[PDB]
RNA sequence: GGCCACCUGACA
RNA sequence: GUCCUCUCC
RNA sequence: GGAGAGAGAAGUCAACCAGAGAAACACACCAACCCAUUGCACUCCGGGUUGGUGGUAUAUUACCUGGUACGGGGGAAACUUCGUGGUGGCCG
């Protein structure tokens, strides 16, 4: 897929509560660059997933390459660039 | 007088 | 206290 | 969204009005398990089981206290006590 500011992440342990997953995710990714926001929803269609929006595309790349299959809550993280831009980035 | 169904009516 | 419709704001 | 109206589900109730007045059911939210989901979103939001919490339900049907229209006693009388849906069927 085409590199993007946001990285789509799935195959995350579904049992983890929303705020906690969101905090861990931030910690693990901060090192790659500033993070404008992190979307996480536990709804039927969105659970097990999360988009992490980076201020700089380059950051999304390193993070993607660096954390592919990383052990997170006992499940290897699957990461890809987001198909389209997230509002925040588009409306900018 | 109970008990089940239904009927009508009250409540909503 | 749900749900449907109608009117009005 | 909010304010009325109508009809109405579930559920409680039974002449009737008034005062007190729960429960039941419906709906909402929370938690814990279980089932399902590998899902690319940016308007929240899958199902199920237990338990819990909530509402101008601050409601009203039981119950209670007053009387009311009929019926039962007693009393000359004043009055004082008792009983109050329709149909079929089943349990003495
Ligand atoms: Ca920060
Ligand atoms: Ca309304
Ligand atoms: Ca009914
Ligand atoms: Ca019933
Ligand atoms: Ca009252
Ligand atoms: Ca009450
Ligand atoms: Ca499974
Ligand atoms: Ca599939
Ligand atoms: Ca959109
Ligand atoms: Ca949603
Ligand atoms: Ca939520
Ligand atoms: Ca319940
Ligand atoms: Ca209740």
PDB file of C-alpha atoms (C1' of nucleotides) and ligand atoms in Angstrom:
ATOM      1  CA  UNK A   1       0.000   0.000   0.000  1.00  0.00           C
ATOM      2  CA  UNK A   2       0.889   3.710  -0.480  1.00  0.00           C
ATOM      3  CA  UNK A   3       2.790   5.402   2.393  1.00  0.00           C
ATOM      4  CA  UNK A   4       0.529   7.635   4.493  1.00  0.00           C
ATOM      5  CA  UNK A   5       0.659   9.884   7.602  1.00  0.00           C
ATOM      6  CA  UNK A   6      -1.515   7.312   9.376  1.00  0.00           C
ATOM      7  CA  UNK A   7      -0.761   3.650   9.901  1.00  0.00           C
ATOM      8  CA  UNK A   8      -3.573   1.153  10.202  1.00  0.00           C
ATOM      9  CA  UNK A   9      -2.939  -1.453  12.924  1.00  0.00           C
ATOM     10  CA  UNK A  10      -4.820  -4.665  13.518  1.00  0.00           C
ATOM     11  CA  UNK A  11      -4.744  -8.009  15.226  1.00  0.00           C
ATOM     12  CA  UNK A  12      -4.580  -6.270  18.611  1.00  0.00           C
ATOM     13  CA  UNK A  13      -5.761  -8.061  21.739  1.00  0.00           C
ATOM     14  CA  UNK A  14      -9.462  -7.286  21.790  1.00  0.00           C
ATOM     15  CA  UNK A  15      -9.837  -7.711  25.551  1.00  0.00           C
ATOM     16  CA  UNK A  16      -7.779  -4.621  26.396  1.00  0.00           C
ATOM     17  CA  UNK A  17      -9.885  -1.645  27.440  1.00  0.00           C
ATOM     18  CA  UNK A  18      -9.938   1.398  25.149  1.00  0.00           C
ATOM     19  CA  UNK A  19      -8.071   3.978  27.185  1.00  0.00           C
ATOM     20  CA  UNK A  20      -5.316   1.555  28.162  1.00  0.00           C
ATOM     21  CA  UNK A  21      -4.752   0.209  24.642  1.00  0.00           C
ATOM     22  CA  UNK A  22      -4.596   3.811  23.523  1.00  0.00           C
ATOM     23  CA  UNK A  23      -1.991   4.718  26.163  1.00  0.00           C
ATOM     24  CA  UNK A  24       0.243   1.699  25.500  1.00  0.00           C
ATOM     25  CA  UNK A  25       0.078   2.365  21.752  1.00  0.00           C
ATOM     26  CA  UNK A  26       1.200   5.928  22.304  1.00  0.00           C
ATOM     27  CA  UNK A  27       4.190   4.883  24.407  1.00  0.00           C
ATOM     28  CA  UNK A  28       5.349   2.300  21.867  1.00  0.00           C
ATOM     29  CA  UNK A  29       5.168   4.740  18.951  1.00  0.00           C
ATOM     30  CA  UNK A  30       6.216   8.104  20.412  1.00  0.00           C
ATOM     31  CA  UNK A  31       9.836   7.428  19.524  1.00  0.00           C
ATOM     32  CA  UNK A  32       9.124   7.633  15.801  1.00  0.00           C
ATOM     33  CA  UNK A  33       7.779  11.162  15.843  1.00  0.00           C
ATOM     34  CA  UNK A  34       5.018  13.381  17.163  1.00  0.00           C
ATOM     35  CA  UNK A  35       1.559  11.811  17.155  1.00  0.00           C
ATOM     36  CA  UNK A  36      -1.398  14.033  16.269  1.00  0.00           C
ATOM     37  CA  UNK A  37      -3.903  11.492  17.556  1.00  0.00           C
ATOM     38  CA  UNK A  38      -4.760   7.779  17.924  1.00  0.00           C
ATOM     39  CA  UNK A  39      -8.143   6.406  16.992  1.00  0.00           C
ATOM     40  CA  UNK A  40      -9.426   3.343  18.800  1.00  0.00           C
ATOM     41  CA  UNK A  41     -12.921   1.935  18.980  1.00  0.00           C
ATOM     42  CA  UNK A  42     -14.180  -1.325  20.405  1.00  0.00           C
ATOM     43  CA  UNK A  43     -17.285  -1.444  18.263  1.00  0.00           C
ATOM     44  CA  UNK A  44     -17.968  -4.662  16.357  1.00  0.00           C
ATOM     45  CA  UNK A  45     -16.301  -3.415  13.172  1.00  0.00           C
ATOM     46  CA  UNK A  46     -13.516  -1.323  14.681  1.00  0.00           C
ATOM     47  CA  UNK A  47     -12.337  -3.501  17.609  1.00  0.00           C
ATOM     48  CA  UNK A  48      -8.943  -5.153  17.372  1.00  0.00           C
ATOM     49  CA  UNK A  49      -7.789  -2.151  15.394  1.00  0.00           C
ATOM     50  CA  UNK A  50      -6.401   1.332  15.684  1.00  0.00           C
ATOM     51  CA  UNK A  51      -5.126   4.123  13.417  1.00  0.00           C
ATOM     52  CA  UNK A  52      -2.175   6.119  14.699  1.00  0.00           C
ATOM     53  CA  UNK A  53      -1.868   9.509  12.984  1.00  0.00           C
ATOM     54  CA  UNK A  54       1.679  10.869  12.679  1.00  0.00           C
ATOM     55  CA  UNK A  55       2.536  14.500  12.033  1.00  0.00           C
ATOM     56  CA  UNK A  56       5.214  13.385   9.571  1.00  0.00           C
ATOM     57  CA  UNK A  57       4.912  10.620   6.951  1.00  0.00           C
ATOM     58  CA  UNK A  58       8.554   9.590   7.398  1.00  0.00           C
ATOM     59  CA  UNK A  59       7.626   8.759  10.998  1.00  0.00           C
ATOM     60  CA  UNK A  60       4.815   6.455   9.854  1.00  0.00           C
ATOM     61  CA  UNK A  61       7.313   4.597   7.684  1.00  0.00           C
ATOM     62  CA  UNK A  62      10.021   3.934  10.287  1.00  0.00           C
ATOM     63  CA  UNK A  63       7.416   2.975  12.845  1.00  0.00           C
ATOM     64  CA  UNK A  64       5.851   0.584  10.330  1.00  0.00           C
ATOM     65  CA  UNK A  65       9.128  -1.088   9.465  1.00  0.00           C
ATOM     66  CA  UNK A  66      10.321  -1.023  13.076  1.00  0.00           C
ATOM     67  CA  UNK A  67       7.212  -2.429  14.733  1.00  0.00           C
ATOM     68  CA  UNK A  68       5.949  -5.009  12.262  1.00  0.00           C
ATOM     69  CA  UNK A  69       4.845  -8.039  14.221  1.00  0.00           C
ATOM     70  CA  UNK A  70       5.886  -6.505  17.506  1.00  0.00           C
ATOM     71  CA  UNK A  71       4.607  -8.432  20.597  1.00  0.00           C
ATOM     72  CA  UNK A  72       1.752  -6.404  22.037  1.00  0.00           C
ATOM     73  CA  UNK A  73      -0.564  -7.839  24.648  1.00  0.00           C
ATOM     74  CA  UNK A  74       0.419 -11.351  23.548  1.00  0.00           C
ATOM     75  CA  UNK A  75      -0.408 -10.841  19.870  1.00  0.00           C
ATOM     76  CA  UNK A  76       1.934  -9.813  17.044  1.00  0.00           C
ATOM     77  CA  UNK A  77       0.987  -6.389  15.788  1.00  0.00           C
ATOM     78  CA  UNK A  78       0.103  -6.227  12.085  1.00  0.00           C
ATOM     79  CA  UNK A  79       0.798  -2.838  10.548  1.00  0.00           C
ATOM     80  CA  UNK A  80       0.114  -1.161   7.226  1.00  0.00           C
ATOM     81  CA  UNK A  81      -0.267   2.352   5.870  1.00  0.00           C
ATOM     82  CA  UNK A  82      -3.872   3.588   5.954  1.00  0.00           C
ATOM     83  CA  UNK A  83      -5.707   3.336   2.594  1.00  0.00           C
ATOM     84  CA  UNK A  84      -6.806   6.959   2.683  1.00  0.00           C
ATOM     85  CA  UNK A  85      -5.907  10.002   4.702  1.00  0.00           C
ATOM     86  CA  UNK A  86      -7.669  10.564   8.007  1.00  0.00           C
ATOM     87  CA  UNK A  87      -9.836  13.706   8.226  1.00  0.00           C
ATOM     88  CA  UNK A  88      -7.308  15.577  10.416  1.00  0.00           C
ATOM     89  CA  UNK A  89      -4.669  15.238   7.692  1.00  0.00           C
ATOM     90  CA  UNK A  90      -7.026  15.779   4.756  1.00  0.00           C
ATOM     91  CA  UNK A  91      -8.707  18.876   6.195  1.00  0.00           C
ATOM     92  CA  UNK A  92      -5.248  20.396   6.586  1.00  0.00           C
TER      93      UNK A  92
ATOM     94  C1'   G B   1     -63.334 -18.947  46.307  1.00  0.00           C
ATOM     95  C1'   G B   2     -59.261 -20.216  43.773  1.00  0.00           C
ATOM     96  C1'   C B   3     -56.252 -21.743  38.732  1.00  0.00           C
ATOM     97  C1'   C B   4     -55.497 -21.366  32.922  1.00  0.00           C
ATOM     98  C1'   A B   5     -57.218 -19.279  28.747  1.00  0.00           C
ATOM     99  C1'   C B   6     -59.945 -15.254  26.516  1.00  0.00           C
ATOM    100  C1'   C B   7     -63.257 -10.764  26.771  1.00  0.00           C
ATOM    101  C1'   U B   8     -64.095  -5.820  28.016  1.00  0.00           C
ATOM    102  C1'   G B   9     -62.039  -1.662  30.837  1.00  0.00           C
ATOM    103  C1'   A B  10     -58.295   1.059  33.801  1.00  0.00           C
ATOM    104  C1'   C B  11     -52.932   2.188  34.067  1.00  0.00           C
ATOM    105  C1'   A B  12     -49.359   3.572  29.700  1.00  0.00           C
TER     106        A B  12
ATOM    107  C1'   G C   1     -40.640   5.361  30.911  1.00  0.00           C
ATOM    108  C1'   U C   2     -39.998   1.342  24.592  1.00  0.00           C
ATOM    109  C1'   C C   3     -41.999   1.422  19.505  1.00  0.00           C
ATOM    110  C1'   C C   4     -45.424   3.687  15.329  1.00  0.00           C
ATOM    111  C1'   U C   5     -48.215   7.925  13.369  1.00  0.00           C
ATOM    112  C1'   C C   6     -50.112  12.988  13.588  1.00  0.00           C
ATOM    113  C1'   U C   7     -49.717  18.351  14.858  1.00  0.00           C
ATOM    114  C1'   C C   8     -46.673  22.341  16.569  1.00  0.00           C
ATOM    115  C1'   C C   9     -41.993  24.690  17.967  1.00  0.00           C
TER     116        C C   9
ATOM    117  C1'   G D   1     -34.195  17.793  20.179  1.00  0.00           C
ATOM    118  C1'   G D   2     -38.388  19.619  22.962  1.00  0.00           C
ATOM    119  C1'   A D   3     -44.108  20.232  23.636  1.00  0.00           C
ATOM    120  C1'   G D   4     -48.883  18.056  22.682  1.00  0.00           C
ATOM    121  C1'   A D   5     -52.329  13.880  20.430  1.00  0.00           C
ATOM    122  C1'   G D   6     -53.690   9.001  19.068  1.00  0.00           C
ATOM    123  C1'   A D   7     -53.241   4.281  19.215  1.00  0.00           C
ATOM    124  C1'   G D   8     -50.871   0.841  21.546  1.00  0.00           C
ATOM    125  C1'   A D   9     -46.714  -3.744  23.285  1.00  0.00           C
ATOM    126  C1'   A D  10     -45.107  -6.001  27.879  1.00  0.00           C
ATOM    127  C1'   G D  11     -47.026  -6.156  32.693  1.00  0.00           C
ATOM    128  C1'   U D  12     -50.253  -5.309  37.256  1.00  0.00           C
ATOM    129  C1'   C D  13     -55.208  -4.568  38.374  1.00  0.00           C
ATOM    130  C1'   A D  14     -61.097  -5.124  38.891  1.00  0.00           C
ATOM    131  C1'   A D  15     -67.809  -1.424  40.766  1.00  0.00           C
ATOM    132  C1'   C D  16     -66.785   4.025  41.472  1.00  0.00           C
ATOM    133  C1'   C D  17     -64.179   8.991  43.188  1.00  0.00           C
ATOM    134  C1'   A D  18     -60.358  10.792  46.605  1.00  0.00           C
ATOM    135  C1'   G D  19     -55.849  10.395  49.793  1.00  0.00           C
ATOM    136  C1'   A D  20     -51.599   7.561  50.571  1.00  0.00           C
ATOM    137  C1'   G D  21     -48.792   3.612  47.587  1.00  0.00           C
ATOM    138  C1'   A D  22     -45.456  -0.357  46.178  1.00  0.00           C
ATOM    139  C1'   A D  23     -44.521  -4.342  42.764  1.00  0.00           C
ATOM    140  C1'   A D  24     -44.635  -6.070  37.895  1.00  0.00           C
ATOM    141  C1'   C D  25     -43.181  -4.916  32.753  1.00  0.00           C
ATOM    142  C1'   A D  26     -40.819  -1.798  29.146  1.00  0.00           C
ATOM    143  C1'   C D  27     -36.462   1.234  28.314  1.00  0.00           C
ATOM    144  C1'   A D  28     -31.317   3.014  29.584  1.00  0.00           C
ATOM    145  C1'   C D  29     -26.495   2.554  31.603  1.00  0.00           C
ATOM    146  C1'   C D  30     -22.497  -0.485  34.238  1.00  0.00           C
ATOM    147  C1'   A D  31     -19.755  -5.230  35.310  1.00  0.00           C
ATOM    148  C1'   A D  32     -18.399 -10.182  34.657  1.00  0.00           C
ATOM    149  C1'   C D  33     -18.479 -14.390  31.704  1.00  0.00           C
ATOM    150  C1'   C D  34     -20.008 -16.680  26.905  1.00  0.00           C
ATOM    151  C1'   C D  35     -20.911 -16.501  21.208  1.00  0.00           C
ATOM    152  C1'   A D  36     -19.576 -13.937  16.897  1.00  0.00           C
ATOM    153  C1'   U D  37     -15.928 -10.623  14.510  1.00  0.00           C
ATOM    154  C1'   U D  38      -8.973 -10.376  11.459  1.00  0.00           C
ATOM    155  C1'   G D  39     -12.666  -5.911  10.752  1.00  0.00           C
ATOM    156  C1'   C D  40      -9.478   0.650   6.861  1.00  0.00           C
ATOM    157  C1'   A D  41     -12.339   4.205  10.315  1.00  0.00           C
ATOM    158  C1'   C D  42     -12.905   9.327  11.597  1.00  0.00           C
ATOM    159  C1'   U D  43     -22.033  10.697  13.656  1.00  0.00           C
ATOM    160  C1'   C D  44     -22.251   6.847  19.284  1.00  0.00           C
ATOM    161  C1'   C D  45     -23.952   1.996  18.657  1.00  0.00           C
ATOM    162  C1'   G D  46     -23.064  -6.823  17.634  1.00  0.00           C
ATOM    163  C1'   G D  47     -25.914 -10.981  20.110  1.00  0.00           C
ATOM    164  C1'   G D  48     -26.669 -13.904  24.722  1.00  0.00           C
ATOM    165  C1'   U D  49     -26.610 -15.073  30.372  1.00  0.00           C
ATOM    166  C1'   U D  50     -26.216 -13.515  35.234  1.00  0.00           C
ATOM    167  C1'   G D  51     -25.912  -9.325  38.690  1.00  0.00           C
ATOM    168  C1'   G D  52     -26.364  -4.319  39.552  1.00  0.00           C
ATOM    169  C1'   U D  53     -27.877   1.024  39.065  1.00  0.00           C
ATOM    170  C1'   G D  54     -31.349   4.546  37.010  1.00  0.00           C
ATOM    171  C1'   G D  55     -36.400   7.840  35.765  1.00  0.00           C
ATOM    172  C1'   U D  56     -40.847  14.993  36.762  1.00  0.00           C
ATOM    173  C1'   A D  57     -42.381   5.544  37.565  1.00  0.00           C
ATOM    174  C1'   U D  58     -42.040  12.030  41.526  1.00  0.00           C
ATOM    175  C1'   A D  59     -46.583   6.865  37.646  1.00  0.00           C
ATOM    176  C1'   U D  60     -50.408   3.774  39.352  1.00  0.00           C
ATOM    177  C1'   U D  61     -53.394  -1.506  39.128  1.00  0.00           C
ATOM    178  C1'   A D  62     -52.491  -4.634  44.191  1.00  0.00           C
ATOM    179  C1'   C D  63     -52.526  -3.256  49.727  1.00  0.00           C
ATOM    180  C1'   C D  64     -54.072   0.662  53.229  1.00  0.00           C
ATOM    181  C1'   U D  65     -57.483   5.028  54.934  1.00  0.00           C
ATOM    182  C1'   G D  66     -61.984   7.865  53.486  1.00  0.00           C
ATOM    183  C1'   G D  67     -66.459   8.298  51.397  1.00  0.00           C
ATOM    184  C1'   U D  68     -69.809   7.303  46.550  1.00  0.00           C
ATOM    185  C1'   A D  69     -73.820   4.431  43.573  1.00  0.00           C
ATOM    186  C1'   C D  70     -76.244  -0.631  44.198  1.00  0.00           C
ATOM    187  C1'   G D  71     -76.691  -5.403  47.827  1.00  0.00           C
ATOM    188  C1'   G D  72     -76.428  -8.082  53.376  1.00  0.00           C
ATOM    189  C1'   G D  73     -77.085  -7.685  59.035  1.00  0.00           C
ATOM    190  C1'   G D  74     -78.872  -4.898  63.566  1.00  0.00           C
ATOM    191  C1'   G D  75     -81.557  -0.254  64.918  1.00  0.00           C
ATOM    192  C1'   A D  76     -87.835   3.090  65.636  1.00  0.00           C
ATOM    193  C1'   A D  77     -84.277   6.598  64.424  1.00  0.00           C
ATOM    194  C1'   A D  78     -79.120   9.073  64.313  1.00  0.00           C
ATOM    195  C1'   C D  79     -76.528   5.410  62.364  1.00  0.00           C
ATOM    196  C1'   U D  80     -73.469   1.385  62.477  1.00  0.00           C
ATOM    197  C1'   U D  81     -71.362  -2.820  60.375  1.00  0.00           C
ATOM    198  C1'   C D  82     -70.441  -6.377  55.937  1.00  0.00           C
ATOM    199  C1'   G D  83     -70.328  -7.615  49.847  1.00  0.00           C
ATOM    200  C1'   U D  84     -69.239  -5.644  44.972  1.00  0.00           C
ATOM    201  C1'   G D  85     -66.275  -7.081  36.185  1.00  0.00           C
ATOM    202  C1'   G D  86     -67.983 -10.565  31.484  1.00  0.00           C
ATOM    203  C1'   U D  87     -67.225 -16.381  29.000  1.00  0.00           C
ATOM    204  C1'   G D  88     -65.603 -21.365  28.943  1.00  0.00           C
ATOM    205  C1'   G D  89     -63.044 -24.756  31.445  1.00  0.00           C
ATOM    206  C1'   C D  90     -59.953 -27.022  35.366  1.00  0.00           C
ATOM    207  C1'   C D  91     -58.944 -28.059  40.647  1.00  0.00           C
ATOM    208  C1'   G D  92     -62.977 -30.326  46.506  1.00  0.00           C
TER     209        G D  92
HETATM  210 CA1  LIG E   1       2.551  14.157  23.403  1.00  0.00          CA
HETATM  211 CA1  LIG E   2     -40.926  12.807  22.411  1.00  0.00          CA
HETATM  212 CA1  LIG E   3     -52.364  -5.772  27.737  1.00  0.00          CA
HETATM  213 CA1  LIG E   4     -49.076 -13.649  31.538  1.00  0.00          CA
HETATM  214 CA1  LIG E   5     -49.338  10.445  44.079  1.00  0.00          CA
HETATM  215 CA1  LIG E   6     -44.692   6.387  44.581  1.00  0.00          CA
HETATM  216 CA1  LIG E   7     -12.611 -16.728  17.862  1.00  0.00          CA
HETATM  217 CA1  LIG E   8     -13.579 -12.114   6.921  1.00  0.00          CA
HETATM  218 CA1  LIG E   9     -15.605   9.763   6.361  1.00  0.00          CA
HETATM  219 CA1  LIG E  10     -20.387   3.964  16.300  1.00  0.00          CA
HETATM  220 CA1  LIG E  11     -18.114   3.696  23.972  1.00  0.00          CA
HETATM  221 CA1  LIG E  12     -32.075  -7.541  33.577  1.00  0.00          CA
HETATM  222 CA1  LIG E  13     -36.745  -1.889  39.093  1.00  0.00          CA
END
